[PDB]
């Protein structure tokens, strides 16, 4: 992902998600920063793991 104006706040608020865990950042501060390179990884597995 590059050259984006990404509004993160319409996805942690305006969505139904089970667990939202950010690790080096906080979710409320995500609108203010700039990220230099973003990657996305998607799959589907069992929810005990």
């Amino acid at each position: 992902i590059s050259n984006c104006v990404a509004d993160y706040s319409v996805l942690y608020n305006s969505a139904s998600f089970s667990t939202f865990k950010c690790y080096g950042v906080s979710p409320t501060k995500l609108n203010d920063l700039c990220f230099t390179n973003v990657y996305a990884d998607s799959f589907v597995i069992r929810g005990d793991e």
Partner: protein, 47 residues
């Protein structure tokens, strides 16, 4: 029932009910589908 924790994010914990960061005291939750289901659509929340 995770957004009733001291410092969280969501439209319950940003728009409806917010706990202070230095909280003292407990949150008690229990499942009740027996009474508040018909359904019952007077339980509103601020969108």
């Amino acid at each position: 029932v995770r957004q009733i924790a001291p410092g969280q994010t969501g439209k319950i914990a940003d728009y409806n009910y917010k706990l202070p960061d230095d909280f003292t005291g407990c949150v008690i939750a229990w499942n009740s589908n027996n009474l508040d289901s018909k359904g019952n659509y007077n339980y509103l929340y601020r969108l």
